[model samples]
Every structure is written in C-alpha cells, then in structure tokens.
Target chain A: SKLIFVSMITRHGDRAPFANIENANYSWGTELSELTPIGMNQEYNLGLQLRKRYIDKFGLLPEHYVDQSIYVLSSHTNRTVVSAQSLLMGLYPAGTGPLIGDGDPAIKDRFQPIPIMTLSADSRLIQFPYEQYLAVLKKYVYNSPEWQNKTKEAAPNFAKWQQILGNRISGLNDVITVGDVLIVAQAHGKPLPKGLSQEDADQIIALTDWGLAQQFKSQKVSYIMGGKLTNRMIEDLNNAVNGKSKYKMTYYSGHDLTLLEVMGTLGVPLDTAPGYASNLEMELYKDGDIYTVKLRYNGKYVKLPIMDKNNSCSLDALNKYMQSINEKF
Target chain B: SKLIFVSMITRHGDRAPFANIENANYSWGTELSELTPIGMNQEYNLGLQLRKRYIDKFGLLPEHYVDQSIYVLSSHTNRTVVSAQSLLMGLYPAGTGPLIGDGDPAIKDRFQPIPIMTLSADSRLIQFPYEQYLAVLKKYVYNSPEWQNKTKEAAPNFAKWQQILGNRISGLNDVITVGDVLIVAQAHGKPLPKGLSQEDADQIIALTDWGLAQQFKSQKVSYIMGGKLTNRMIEDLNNAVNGKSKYKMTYYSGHDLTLLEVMGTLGVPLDTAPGYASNLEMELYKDGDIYTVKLRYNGKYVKLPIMDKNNSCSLDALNKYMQSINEKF
Candidate 1:
C-alpha cells in the first residue's frame, strides 16, 4: 500500500457509563463517567498499535511526536481527553517525543503537553447530530414503526432486565442506557445480577445493539444523521490528497456512536456495538497521480459498497457517492 | 445606579506567577502557575459580592442564574475556568442557580454543569495584540524615551534585585519576569528576599508595572493592543442596549494583563496594580428611553475622562469615544 496519509477515529477507552444506571451494587466514586484504569490501558495499547503501524513499520512519523506530524483531537469528556493522552503515552514513549519543552531540567515535567483539541456544543463538527436530525430522531425513536417493533420485541425481557436494573427503565432507549453500565461493570470484575449468567447479559445487550443498528441503518436517516461529520472527513481527505494538510496523521478520539454514525455514512453497519477503543482507519495512497482510499475497522478492511465494488476505492468515486447521498437528504 | 444589564471582566485569583524564580526558598510543587486555594476563595467571595449587588441590592439579575440570562467566559486555561466555576459557586449557590437540571435523581451530581465558556487561541477577542502591533511594541519598549527613562531610574536597584533573585537576571525584562513570582510568593506568606521588606518588594513590582502601564498607554498602542477586546465589549454593550442578547450578565474571567489591556483601551490607567480577582464592572442603565453606562474598577467608580465627564458615562458617548480612538490608530 502506497500510503501517503492516514486519518483515524477511535472510541474513548472503557469507562464508567453515564450516571443513569440505578441500584447497580458497584459504587462509582467521585469519578463517575471518568476513564477507568482498564480504559487507560486500552488506549495506551491502541497508541502502541498506531506507533507500530505509523512509526515502526512505515517510517511515516518520527519516533518522537514531530510538531506538525500528527493532530490529536477528542470530545469534551475527561475520559476521551485522557484517552488521547494515554494514546500519546504509548505513541511517544519517554525520551522519544513526550518531552514538550526544550530539554530544560528546570521545567521538569516528563510528559509532553500535547494539545488535545475538544469540540464545544455550538461548534461541533462531529459527535452530536444537528438539532433538525435530533428532532427527527426523537420522533423516530418515540413513534416510528421501526422503533415500535424493537420496543415490542424487547418487551418480554424488559421486566427481568428492569428488575436486574432495579426497575429504572422508561423506554427502549434505557435498554442500552441501563444495560451498558452492567456490561462494563461485569467486564471490570463486577458480578452479574443473581441467576443471570454472563451469556444472558451479553445476549440482552446484543439485542439492544441490534435495535440501535436498525435505527442507524436507514439510508435517509444515516445520510442526514452523519452528513456533517462525513462532509468534514471528506474535506480533510481532500486536503490530505492535495498536500494541503501538514500532519501525516489526524486522529479523532470520540465515542462508539460517533464511529457508528460515521460508518453508517460510509454505508457500513455494525453487527454488534463497537468495543472500547474501537477505531476506523482511512489510508490515503498516491499511486502515480491516482489517489486511492482504503478504510479498515477494528483491524479488518470493511468494504464501503456505497462508493466502490471493493475495499480499495478511488477518492473521486467516494466523493461522488457521498455527494449523491447528501443530495438525497 | 439605574442598572439594566451588567458586564464584567475579572482577574483570575491569586496564583503562583510565571515560572522564572531562581532558587526561591519555597517549592511550588506541581501546581506551578495555577490558581491556589486562596485565589479560588477570592473569586468565590467576589461572586458573593456580585450576587449581593446584582441580585439582592439592585434587582438587576434574578436570584437564580437563568439559562439564557448569564454568560460566563474564560480564557482556555484551567485557572481561569476554575475561577469562573468558583465564582459561580457563590454567585449562584447550589440551590440558587447552579443546579442546572430539573432535579433528576439519576443525574445526582452536586455541582451544576454551569458552562464556563473557553476562548480559543484562534478566535481570541482579548489578550495578545496582533503581530503587526507586537513589532511596533518591541521597538517602543526597547527604544522609546519613556522606557529608557524608566530603565535609567531602576539601574542602581537592578544589581540589588539581581542578587536577591539569585543572579537569574538576563535583561531589564527579567526584573518583572523573574520578580513577579517572588511578589506573589511573598503575598501568600512566603518570605521576601534576604533583606527586602514587603514595601521593598512592592516598590520593585510597582516599577515593573509602571513600565507595562507605559507600554499600554499610547493612543495608537492602546487601540491596537486592545482593539479586538474593546470591539467585543462594545458589541455586547450594543446588544444589551438593544435588548438583543439573551444573557443579562456577561462575565469574562481572565488574566491581570487582560484586564490591564482592556482598561488601557478604554483610556483608563491603573494607579497601582490590579489585585487578584480584581474586576471591572460596566452597568448599562435604561432610564425611560436613555441608556446610561457606568464603569467601576475593583469596587470604586472610575471616571471615564477619556469618554465623558464622570463615572456614569452615556452609552452613546462611550461608543463614540471608542470609535474615535479606534479611528485614530
């Protein structure tokens, strides 16, 4: 692969879920919704993997983080920001790149103060959907036949799941909202509810994720839902191909939903929910003047059938495909 | 004081100064150049004072901080952001205004996620002057007769100050650069240099501030140095006068120099130096049809002789005065 530039997005490392879960025996200290130790390790490993790919294998990046070699960005959550930092820890080890200042012992901080760019609510390019889409999504989730079907499908298990969740559910959305904390809690050594095996919990969570996949799969919904983020990525892609961007790599550390929407925009739907630190890698290559694009998710090449016949597609084809999708919405 | 809309800019509370103190007897741990507990407390009290003035006394603002009623902005630094948050703790007590949500038990965090808006380097309306102005200031600082006179006045004491600073003196700039940390250190119960009294340290700091005040004094310098910030304030002022802005109270938490630069733009020079959490208050009043503007600093009213006859200047007069200053340079 004649890779010239790489753009990637990673899910923030595993962490305590949002504080909507009720009566889960585990106590989330002052650091609720914060990155857990396991999450830190997850991102650190992801950074190491990136270092291996970009620096060790390809020689694309310097051993130390060059000033203009890479950009690290994340959403405004502490877990996401910490994930970016943790990634840097693995990406640029001690004495390699993390030493920020000009080697003055006087300024004896070891880690580089790598600027983790965060997006605020008003000026967000990704993560949150636009108000128009959000309004549509709320209506879809509340009354649409697709959502109505999922709610009815999950009705039988709702009682048992609600009892396990201490009966703190209101709608189909709470299945994921309440269940994710338990899923993560079990992953981190917490026991499942009495008489419910790990398999049972997994099955329940998978059922909810399937419903979510259905919600994100609609062609019209996906185009409108993820168009802004897709357009941003396309802009950066063109910038990279044109030798306009300075950095060799641009990394966006975001959420599972961010990845889902982005993938949905590219016409790939997830079978199961994305795991912690799950990433999508977009490799831009220059083969004699023809710019080729290849995208990989979770270490495997995922074919973007919307753009091309196979995994390796031309930039023009992708742009044309994306434009057609946008025109529809 | 027929106050209608209130605008304010506050200095971030007491903190360890910039890192240039050579062998200061006390160790400042890892929290170098950050807000201290005392500084946090100072801003909190300032918030209390504001609550009394605006909410209790004048009825300018409601007892509770309404959603669209207050805009709190800070430079993108933890100290200023924390200062903003600390101020909110007192300004809007937990029950009074900070509790953002409608008492949802699941989301039971004590602190209201009172948004402390941060200004980015790219979109900064305040702080550093532009590169063009910077070049001019460098010439003015190094060669201007005013600066030369100040340098000559401080020459005899420069050696003494150098010795006290443990001989870390590089240039005349270090007198302030290296001296400020010691000034702040002494303020927080850390001792003055071997023989220097508090008054001695005060004089040294004052001399440095005098140089700065001169740097920001000239009409051309002031307008160019503070133009961006002044325009933003003027925009907010117009919005308030027109009853257009959603936020009734607009607060900017920033550095001492930021306040200095802004005040300089308004043609107001400080007699001494601004204290920690020192703030400038702009109260816009609507007496029937006429809108009057009153400016105060720290606590006392400061007459805007540059714009009008007294402390309570008319909005039109202030805007006209600002426009004239801007047009000149």
Candidate 2:
C-alpha cells in the first residue's frame, strides 16, 4: 500500500482565562474562584502546533472527504473536554461553525458541546466477556493477607516490565517489576503459575501486539492489546473478521501494569526501565507470500530529538518533530 | 410600684473589636459590625457612675441586688447583642454578674443555645408563636422620604426632637431619628397614624415600652446604649408599666430613636440633648401615686457629662459623687 492514513492521541492543553479574583484557585471554592492566564496560553499554543503539523499537511477538511477516516476520542475531565474542543476548532473552524439545524437552542449561537468517550475503569475487567470480574479482581487488586503477599511477589516482574516497556509495550510502574511479582508469588502460597502456562503468555503477548497492528488495517477498530507481541496475536488480529478490517490509525493507552501483564513472558532484565511516553510502534509490511516485523524505537522516543527534557522543554519544536510521522506517513 | 429603682434608656454599648479593614465592616453583615476600645470605656464609665449614683446610695443589693433587680432589652441585632453584654459585664463583672440572665441569649448563657429575639423590620409582623409586636417600626427607624418630609413640615417640633438628638444623630447619612414615626405611618400606607388613634398608638407603643418599663421596675439594672439618644425617648420609656404585672426597674438598649419614641408620646420637651454618656433618673413613690420620673444629672454623674455640643462637659465641677436611700414603703 503506497498510502498510510493516520490517527493521533494527545493530552489536553492549557487553561487560564477563567481566573477569578475571589479564589483564583479553588481555595474559596466555586463561588470565589476561576482559572488562570497560563492555562489559556498552553492550550492555545498546543492547538496552533497541532494544526500546522497535521491538519495542514493532510489537507484535513472538517467534512472528512477521505473515505472511512480516523475518529477522535477524549477523556471526561473538564480540562480534557475543553482541550478536545480547542483542537477540533483549530482543525475545522469554517469561520461560521458546525452546521446547525433551523431550530436552534440557546447555546447554538456558541460552540457546540464536544462528544467524548471512555472505557469505565470496570470495563477493563470485561476484556474477556467469558471471564468473571472476580477473577480479574483476584488477579489484580484483591488484597487479603495471601493476596497482599502475592501482590508483593508480582512487583519484581512488574519492575522488569517497566524496564523495557517502551521497546515492547510501555513503562510499567514500580509494582509491575520482576522483584515485586516474585514477592507476590511467594506471598500467595501458590507456585508462580509457572512453566506449562508459560505458553499461555505468548498468546497474551501476541494479542496485545495484534490489537495494535489492527490499527493499520481496520477502518473502525483503532487499537488492541495482549500479553505480549507474539506471532499469534500479530496474526489473529490481522485476520480478525476478514483480515484486519477497520481502522487505519491506532493507539494503546495503558498503565505500566498493563504492559507488565503482557511483557512478563520475555523475562526482561529487572533493571531495565521504560522511558517516558514509551510506546511500542510496529509497521507490518507484506511481500506477496511473506510478512515482516519491523520494530522501530530504542528508548529514544522518550528522548526524542525535539523533546529531550535533557535538551529542552516539550514545546513547539519537540511536539512538531515527534509527531512528524503522522504527517509524513 | 414602690421605689424609683434605677432606670435608663440607652444605646447598646461597644460591640466590635475593629472596623474598616478588608471591607471587614461588611463581613458577616453590615449591622453585625461591633464597637471599639473607646466604646467600652464610655459604657464602663457609665456603669461606675450608676454604681455610685444608685447602688452605693440606695444600699441596693441582694434582696435588691443591682444585678438581679436590673432588667434590660434591645433591638435584636448582633452588635446590640454584644453591646448589651459588654455593658452588663462592666456593671456586674464576674463576681457580681447581674444576678439573673435575660431572654437575650448573649446575656444568659445558661449553656443552652438561647434564641436571640429580634424585632423584625416591620415590627408589625407578629412572630410565629403568634405574639403580636407593636407596630412602632415607623417611629424608630429614620432616613425615609416620610421622615424627611416630616422634618421639613414641622420645623419647630422636629427641632425639639432634633434638639435632644443633638450631634448624636445629626451628621449620620442614614439614621433613625425622633421623626421616624412618620416613616412608620407612611410604611403602613397612611398618614402619621398620629396620637389621633391614641388607643391604637398606645396599644402599638406598648410592644416595646412595656418591655423597657419592666426592666426598669427591677431598679438595680445598670445599662448603656453607646451610639446616641433623644430626651423624649427617655421620658416615654420612664413611664412605669404600673399594671398587675408592673416592672419596677428597666433599661433601654437603643439610639436616639429610643429617646425620641418616648418623648413623642410622653408630652415632655427635653431642655436639651444629653451628651454621649448622660444619665436619666426617675423617682418611684412607694405609696399612693407611683412611677414618678425625674432627672439626676448633678455631681460626678455630670462630670465630663456627655461632652454636650453646647459645652455641658462635666469635667470641671464635681469630678464625681455618691449615694444611698430610704427603702421604707
């Protein structure tokens, strides 16, 4: 395929103009407070950068002339909601606005409310509809003495998970390291479900890898995840519902634990630590009868040339450069 | 009615600790603002004078303990509450804290959350318990078109009210005065409901005058109203509540309206306005005819005597004086 469409993910932008003299901060509460100046500038700047780097390059029209194009989703917090609206406005302001119906409500004269989506925290437990939530709960958060001990044993592996996260999945927190996982295993009074089940790990890994790869082939499905990137996950997702059907763009938003649960099979070095905003990127290419896996990234994405906290702030230059792929591809 | 026990119609004493900071005066509320250090000294000084003029002279104690016998009441506002409390404190102090507490919760901290009784703005609106209030609201509040018109209409009589009002109320932008009765009548959607309806007026004035007279029947009360006073108010208030439930001692916690409300009805003209801390005395006959009113402004009571605008300052003659009385009925 000569053409590669795009998808994007980003944090909300700055907020400030809402500042109130009475509370400035939420000190006195809703009655006396409001936002500050700095916040407004941050969001405005982000919008400008997003427009120049992506929309301008893609000739993105609010009408979505491109067939089966990318869709946007946002978090539910006020900051995120405002940010999403800000970005959309930058991308599609017609100087007039969204087409309104003849019958307008009070706010139709102003900005339309932005739609947002999110998987409720509990939704994670339903990842496998057949699996009961109690089991997922047991696997992750249940905390009796035995559970506490098991959790302890799980931390070490989690740490290891954290180490090579960006390269394989993403950064796992301190709890997801190797040492902690082992501690949790010991505390649980159960053998760390080892050996035979080790095979099961590959399936999980493959699923996560497959879920992400789906982004490239499908128009509706944006992303996916599994234990770790394995041939199976890579293949099954690509073949799901007639060979990778819907989305063209995809992203996986997960915590370190999510990365560790999938990456644990690799037996990563306990000291390996994932870099900031660590995300694993995969590009799958086919040559008639064969397929190729090209893993692209050294922890350098965490230290992108533009945003190396080591070099400068993650501002205009950093944001512009790091996101160059969406424009180029 | 046996004796002319101590009687006074006064402005509530010092209430606030500070004023005019951070719009602090308006904090909590406008009327809630309190008195100051100087206000306390004025009230306390008055208490000491009362102690000498009445208690020391009449051998007023226990069976007739100044504290137990004294009764006081006030317009139900925060400043006035604390004002009444401060003055009572000076007159009695810890050891001799007025032998009894009043309905004013601030004064009677029986440990119960006592209710603060207040007269509503209309005063005519009876309280929920169904006790009707005297509709003297008009006669006591000032700064209305009606009060101003009355002032313009009756140069001579309004002058009389103004004479006793002295500088106590003259300069204030918005203040209740000897002429506020006209405003009350206007509020009622009528003319000065003048004594034309003597019975009605008598019935209405009784609401507060009765309370004041009751406090005076006790005879031992030492009280002070800090702001200002009118001589007529003192006269009307001096009228003994000589019924089956007659009060022998009383105190008035108010302003110039306190005195004006009294004089407007008592048919007496004050020779002049009393200065800041001037005292009004009355004599009660134990035999046939009782409840006789008089003025005992001489000696120490007159020293530095309220610093009259006309140079009636009592600083020169008698730095002070003392007293005692025959208790035979």
Candidate 3:
C-alpha cells in the first residue's frame, strides 16, 4: 500500500490555566491561557515525529518544504499559532527555508516564517459545538442516576474543595476548571492547594474525566460538534483520490474540545481528556485499485466497525458511514 | 515633554500581491498576500526605530520586556501576526526573553515567543467599515464632478488597462488593484506589463491616491469607519492617565485601511495611500500638572486646529474635539 495523502488535527501543547486558583501558589512565566516553553517543545517534538514518519519513512512529503505540498490552519489564538510555528520549524528545519535577509544574524539564515491561516474563533469549521454539547450533557448525562451516584460519592471532597476554590466551583463544569488548575500546578512541580491531598486531586481528575467523556455521548451532539471538520477531512481525501488535490499533507491545530468532538463523531471512545499536544491522524492509501483509510490517535491505530480485522477500512466504507451519519443529521 | 504613554497602530509590511497579474510575469518567493522577508525586515526596522526613540532616548520602556508593560493586538491575518512577531523580536531581541527550553539549540536561548492577541477578522474593533465606506463613496464621491473629471482624464488608459487586466478592472476601486499590481511588480524589480509605460503607471498611482483619499472625506463615513477604534484608544489613554492600565505601550497590527480610517477619524488629512508598514502614533505627555497629546504619522507631527502653536494639544482639548464628534450621528 502506498500512502496518498494525510490529514492531521492536533490540540495545542501545555498551557497555563485559563483562570487562577485562590491559593494555587504556582508561578507561570507566561500569561494565563498562554502556551509555556514546555508547550512549545511538545509541539516541536510532535512535528519532528511527523517529519520522521512522513518524510523519512513513507516519502510522503519532500525533504524541503514545497509550499503547495502542505497547508497549515490554526485556531485564532496565540498558543495555537505559536504551536504551529514551533511545529513547522521541526518539520522543515533551518537550512531548508530560503535565505533572503542580509542583516540581523539571529534571523538572517536561522528562521523560516511560514504563513498560518486562521478563521474567526467562532467559525464552525474549527469551533466545538459548546452550547449544544453542554445542553445534551445537562439533559441526559448530568441528570442521570450514574452522575448522581458519582456526585454523592464525591460529596465530601466536593464540599471541602469548593470551599477552598471559591465561587469558581459550583457545578461539574467548574469541577473541570479545578481539575485543570491542579493538573497545571502539578505540571509545574508545584504542590496542590494547602488542604488538597493526592486523593482529592485524583477524585477531581476522575470527575473531570467523567464530565468530559460524557460530552458527545449523544449522536446529535457528536455530529453537531464534529460534522463540519469531518466533512472537510472527507473532501480532502476525495480530492486526493480523484487526482484533484495539490496538497500532500494538511495540518489543523485546535483545542482539546476539537479532538474530543472529532473522536466522538468517528465513534471513537474517549477514556479521558486529551493530554497536551494530542493528535488525531487520518491516512489515505492506495493498493492497486483499492483505496484504504487508517485512523490513528496518539500513536495507536483506531478500530471502527467499518474496518476489517486489520484496523483499516476502504474509502468507500468510510464514505458510506459518513453518509449514514449525514442522513441522520 | 515627558512621554507618559504610547499607542501605535501600524500596517503590516510589504507582501506578495493578493492576486496575480494576467500576463505580467514575476516570481514571488512567498505566497500571495504573505509578508515577504523584506516585509519582515521592514517591521524589524520599525521596532528598532521605536526602541531607539522610546527605550534609548526616552527611557519609557524597560530594556528587557516586562509582560505587563506592553500589549500587542493584531488582526487575524498571517502577515499581521508575523509582522508583529518580527517586530517583537526587534523590540526585545534574543537575550531579553526568558530562557527555559533545553532541547533545541536553535531556539533554546535565541527566540522569545510572545502572545499576540487577535479577534475575529470581522470584529468591529480593527475592521474597516468597508460596505458603509463604499456606500458613501457611491452616493457622494463617485457621482461628483471631481470623480467624473478624473475618469474622463484617463479614458484611453482605462480602456487599454481594462483590456489587459480582464474582468478585475472596472471602476475606481479596480484602478487601485491595477496600481497595486504595478507597484508590487516594480517592488520585485519587474518591468511594466506589455503596452504599459511609466506615464501610465504614474497615472494609475494618481487615480488610486485620489480614490483612497476620497473615502473618508465625509465626517459620517470617518466616524463609522473609525469610531470604535478611536474610542478604544481613548479608553487606553484614560486608563493610563488614571493609573488603571497595566500597559505602558500598546501596539496594534492591522491593515492599510485601519491606518486610513483612524487618520480619517482624527480629522487628519490624507494625502496618499498609506505605504506598507506605515504607522500612526498617539503619544500622551505629562508636565507639571498639565497633560498634552501629540499625533505623528510616519514621523511627522500632525497639526489640527485644536492644537497649540507647538503642534500639541491639551488632553482636554482633544477630549472636547472627540466629544464634539461623538455628539454627531
């Protein structure tokens, strides 16, 4: 089988918490919600991994960047754009880009500035179906006996944690915020808040995971959140198959919600919130007269009902599945 | 005069033409509408100039970047974002940023990634009122004798250029496109298109200049195009004066239209289309219990009737002028 085209969508790397906790003593070198140096490295390493896989192994992309061969689209945020920038550096390092400037030794030959395209933050293409997904969560998942049981199990910890975390913790959504704060603080080698023990942290993480995993359980929510991007991916594959595309690889940099919704749309089960720089890849290949599609998330081949035992499905099978979903929607 | 705060709005630097010329051949190293290496250098040089004036001369900014001291906002475009990135590199340089990453020798200590904020492309804060401005032009400027005379003066050249440029050339707006094509071609050291001469190029430039200058002559058009940004700038200045602002310097990276509309709103006369990397600066000064303001465009002090003999106006006068404009529809 020969790889014909590839599409990748990645969550941005490690970032500071979007909001500060009352007594979380960790210091972030960057602003809130901004990507950290560690985050940049993660994206850079991801890029290097892709370069090795696509260029060194499969011969899918050129050794040097051919502008038409690749496209980069990032969400309209600093962290996403900078992550895309850091990743491109690893994909096509220094000497590969053109040397045009004569002054400033730092940038003269060492930097390559590639254009990153972004749509409005609210554009449907990359935005998660936040309100619709939340509605589904509220009506179905949050109100269910399973959620009630979990809440009752964590009641003691929740009361203590809410007292410490202030008004930011009133519901399950706010529990996710507290979980993020704890995780980010731990990432920076900081201890949890004074009274927050490891057990409490674990419980917060579990609740956060449970809440996030429940987001796209409804087919309607999954399609609403991920349908546009999935359609775009299908179109990219169809164009490549029909010999109507110029791009060899297309990369999208988005958020954790983007990854979750896409996974949900593809009927991929979510075990937890995606970690920093998590990626979902779809590769299109051709063998003789047959076109096959393989989907991967975080280095593992994803299995779907349409796939054969080999964990790969024909393009037609993927198309038919998408059509079925479209018809329902 | 002691500078208390600065707000600068700048157009992005030189870029490849947005669209290709039919038969006029030129090789652009970058994609269309992308900022070129030369453009990057233009922004870098601008940063250097500002550093010299604000840091070295006035000691307004710290020698090293302090995140709270500066704020950067860019329109959601690659050229603008990259331009801001390049400019920040010049503003702070390699050694001034934090050093934390240990992996890549290229970026370990040499690059500082700063967060550049951007709203949606359609956000009114930085967007030009294109439809409203065009409506005003059609209603008043285009139907006037002045426009008629200019059109009649270039009738022969218009016929020839329209034949060469095809459907893209139709009216005054299209004339600006031709002018841009010619100017961009010349910037790349290419010759004029066949059957085009220096005189024709000069005429095209003149017509483009005339059309652009006419855009905000009406006060209503000017306010509609720039009122939001003008109000934002005023708020920034007021906050700085009241010690409610964290930033000492605020930079906006936007389009040529952003610069033009701001100038129009301030009652600044437009003589020509703002060149690439053009800037408009508003500096607030404090001296012995009196506050004064000076406006500069491309390094020259802008004079208005409200200003004193020193070409600077008291903040009170400036506020009253704004109030008078605000009182209008």
Candidate 4:
C-alpha cells in the first residue's frame, strides 16, 4: 500500500502569440494575452486526462472537489486564470461534486466557481523578483557580451525573416513574437504570407527557440529567472510528504516560458518550445517510512537528474538539491 | 474649450481582513483573498458614482464601456479581479451599453465581460523591483539608526499590545496584519476580545500606519515602493492629453497600501489608512494650446504641490514632476 501526492506546473493551453509594440497592429481581437476557444478545450482535455488517472484509475482524489485537498494558482493574467477555471470545470463537472449555487432553484449557472490564486505584480507575496530579474538582464545581457554573442549567432536567421517582413526585425523579442504569430496562424489554417515557405516557418521557429535559450544559458541566469518558483515547489512537496499539509495536489498554471525556465534551471534544457498544456508533475510516493519522488513530463514518467543528481532521491536528498537550486540565485 | 481625460487609482472596496501566521487556524471560507459580497456592492457603488461623473456630468466617457476608451487593471487576486468585474457591471450595465451576446436567444449571462488587465508577478512588465526592496530595507532601515529610533519611540505602545496578545509583536508586518484584523472586526461588528477596547484598536492602527509610513517616508523609499505604479499613470495621462490614446478614462483597482504608498510618495501623505474605496484622480484639461491638471482625493478637488508646484501646472510642468519622480528611482 502506498500514499501519493502530486504537484504540477503546467503551461496554459494554446492561444495567440503575444502582441507587443513590434506587431501591435495585428487584429488580435481584444487583448493578445487571451486564450482562444481551442485553448480552452486543450486545458479541459488536460483536466479530463488527469481526472481519469487520479480519480478514476487510482482513487487518489474523491469524485467531488474538496475545499482543502487541492489548490490551483495561475499567473495574474486573463488566459491563465480562465484556463485554470476551465480545467477545474472539467476536473469537477456539475452534479458530480462542484460547489453549487446558493441552493436557490431560481438560479441556474451550474458551473462552480473554483478558486485560482494570484497576486499583484508589485506584491511581496511573489518570491521571484521579476523586477530585479529585469535589472539583471539590463546589466548582464542587454548590450552585454551575452546579448552580442546571441544576436551574432542568430543574425543570419533574423535577416532571412526580416526580408520576408516589410520591416526590419529589431531583436529577439521580434523574432519570438513574429514567429509566434506565424505558428498560431498556421495552427488556425490561415493563409501564409506571400513569400513565406514551410522551411522558412520552421527556421523562424528555430531562431525564436534558440534566442529564448540564451536567456537561461547559465545557473546564474536560471536562478535569477526561476529559483523562487522551484524553491516554492520544494517547500510544498515536503509539506505533503511530511504530513504537514492537507493538500493531495497543487497546480501552477502558467505560460510556455514558465515551463522552460523551471526545467532549464533544473539542468534539463528544453531545446524546443513547450506546446500548449504541456505539464511537468512531481509526485511523492510514501514507500513504508521513506519518501521518494517521481516526475512526469506531459504524463510520461521520467527520471530527473537535474533535481535528483543520481536520478533517485529520497526526501532529504530532494530537499538538499532544492536548497542548492535556491542558492544559485 | 479643452478636451480632457481622467485616470484614477482606487482601493478595492472591502475585504475580509487578511489572515496571518498568528491566526492561521481560522477558516475564512474559500480563498481569503476572494472578494466578499459586501465588497462587490461597494465597488458597484463606486462604479455608479464614477459613471455619473465621467459620463453624465463631464461627458468624458460614452454612456457605454467602449473597447478602446477605458481600461481597468487590478491585482491578480480574486477580490480585486472580481471587484473590477463588479465595478464594470455597474459602470456599463446591460441596458446601459455593455457588450451583449450575439443577440443569441440561447445565451444569457447578460453582462459584458470587460477586460481588466494584469500580468504575472514574475513579469518584467513591472519596472518596480519589490524583491530588492527587502534588500534595501535590510540595508538602509532594519538595523539603521532610524529603525532603532522608531522602535525606541514605539516600544511602550508595542509592549502594551504584546502583553494583551501574550506574545511580542515583532515589527511592521505584525502591526499591520494584527491591526487590520482588529479594524476589520470592528467594521463587521465582530465581538472584540475582553481586554481590547476601541482606544486600543485605534492605537494599534495608528502604530501600524505610522510604521508603514516610515517605509515610504523618504523620496528614495517612496520611489522604490511605488514608482512603477506612478510611472504607469503618467504614461496613460500623457497619451490621453497628447491625443495619442483613445482612452478618456482609466481605473486602477488595488489595496489600501497601494493608495497610501502612491499618495505618500507624492508629498500628499495620507494621515490615516485610506478608507474602503478611497480614490485619487488625476484629470488633464487642454484649452487651446495650453493644458492644466487637477488632483482629486476621494471626491474633493485638491491642490497637489508635488505634481503642480503652484497648484496650477501646465502639461510641461506636470510631465517634469513625473519625470523627477521617475528619476528618484
């Protein structure tokens, strides 16, 4: 017999690429940071998949949503919050144990309003100091050796994309944004720009992905970028293993960069962009008196040497490793 | 005749007093950060008040919530987002020109979902680096002479509260949290502890408020604590005044300290904590080739020496004051 507790950090389901000053003129209906309808379905599918494994297969959770056993948090953005909510609706469908109405027969929005925790960007509650990260980027990367090197390496690819575009590609930001729009356009079956070929599209994707990799090339960059998220996860996992928490599961719903940064910091470099609804889960197994962890990427069990040096870690070892990651910051 | 625009930073209507380590045992139902029913009404009231002034009186906003002319943002917390939504419902009621469904007969939630923008706490979008603010506090205040002097001055008052609590009150974090619970309890007519009198309650609030003020006392501290928010306001105001933006009105919904910190930094120190729904508005009026600004606190027009040094600043003067505030950081 065993007890299992899980915590996951997930990328929110598909959406339009972010529109910034470089391509803000594109008609991205309302805000660019919104999840599309297909995006909503993707998160719902993820929830359904998880519900099948945890609730139906393993009996890890009750049929109904419990107030304390599971917690969900999202980046303070429209897409992630709604994605979390949509996932919850799929996880705990109505009449099968979601929080219902005021018990009024007259009221009929059967959907339960699940809680998705978030905080202000200015709040001290966020352990990751993104503001300081920006300052660090300004100092160490922007116009620095790292920036110059990365740009030099990617210069040819950028020039190719710039030729296709009516305007000059400014920097890494433009490559990713423009690449994202093309990728999303292709996903929605939109007509390609006149001269753009499939090979060029793939190259744009590669260039964008490569550009993103430069941001987390070293331990210092990774630590400044995502150590707090990693640190918080460790604390949460330990609480469950030590019997100090009532939670059986916790979900952190976020973006693609959120996934890549966490994994990149943990010694597992992601060469390609994480797809929508991509998830990395950390599961704790209570084997007799000792606890061990198993990780899953998109539900496929795998070994994580970045977190567990030997690919096998007891609770103490995991905590020790996490502490080291925290120190890198 | 001058075409004008207005923007405001407002405290969220109300909330359950925040919980802390000392009172972690209490079950507040759902996320403690969720907006209360009363809080929603309070925001709705503010929306009505604003609708009357900005739309009915000044004709600044059209009677409806336009996609382009007005924007709202808040903390990613449930209370603030919901409060923003509630405020929108009142500001642009269904019959009053909020977005309706495709006139679909089957669809019926009646309310238009207006966008309330928010970014993740880990976003570089926010220039304010609050994580390093702690470091600054550690370096400049915690063990500094000012800290020592403030602690010495406030010892007796703190000692009394500690005695009543059966433990020592540590510092600003304790005072604000503990004091908030008491003040909120007072607002809600909850029974006070036997030893706690209204005088004691008021004293606790005073101590906390005073302690908080110390953090934002200097221009450096103020810039560090509230500059990003202030910086954002100036950009939005300039866009409106310079005919570069369609937004004639904007709203920022946040917490008590948010309002206090902004006002405090501007040399308009709030004597006490901002009451629920307290609003600070900045209005710009253009007459022929000249522009003028007005500052309003809560609903009363006031002369702000910080922004308009003569209580009458032209657009250039106001911009310089904003630029100076930015420079302080």
Best by TM-score: 3
- Name the candidate, 1 or 3, with the larger TM-score value: 3
Greater-lDDT candidate between 3 and 4? 3
Any residue pairs clashing in model 4, and if so which?
A: none
Supply candidate 2's per-residue lDDT for A56.
Answer: 60
True contacts kept of each: 0.00, 0.00, 0.18, 0.11
Give the per-prediction TM-score of chain B.
0.88, 0.42, 0.92, 0.84
The native-contact fraction of candidate 3 is: 0.18
**TM-score ranking, high to low:** 3, 4, 1, 2
Model 4: residues with Cα > 4 Å off, grouped in runs? A1-5, A18-27, A30-179, A195-232, A242-254, A257-273, A285-292, A303-329, B1-5, B16-180, B195-236, B242-254, B261-272, B285-292, B303-329
Alpha-carbon DockQ of candidate 1 = 0.04
In order, the first chain's TM-score in every candidate is: 0.88, 0.34, 0.92, 0.84
- The sequence of per-residue lDDT tens digits that candidate 4 reaches over residues B119-144 is 45454222233566567667665676
lDDT of 3 by residue, B283-327 (tens): 889897898988988988899779988889988888888888788
lDDT of each: 0.69, 0.32, 0.77, 0.65
Give per-residue CA lDDT, model 2, range A1-329, as digits (tens).
Answer: 11132333343332222222121112211111111122222333444554564456534333321212333332223333334434443343213222223533212122221222322323341132224423543444343353456445544444334333221222222223222323222322334232314333333333333322222221111112222222233333244224454444332322222233223211121123222122333233344444332322321222333333342232233224323522432
Evaluated on chain A only, model 1 obtains a TM-score of: 0.88
Could you give the interface RMSD of candidate 4 in angstroms? 6.6
Model 3 docking grade = acceptable
Docking band of candidate 2 = incorrect
lDDT of 2 at A237: 27
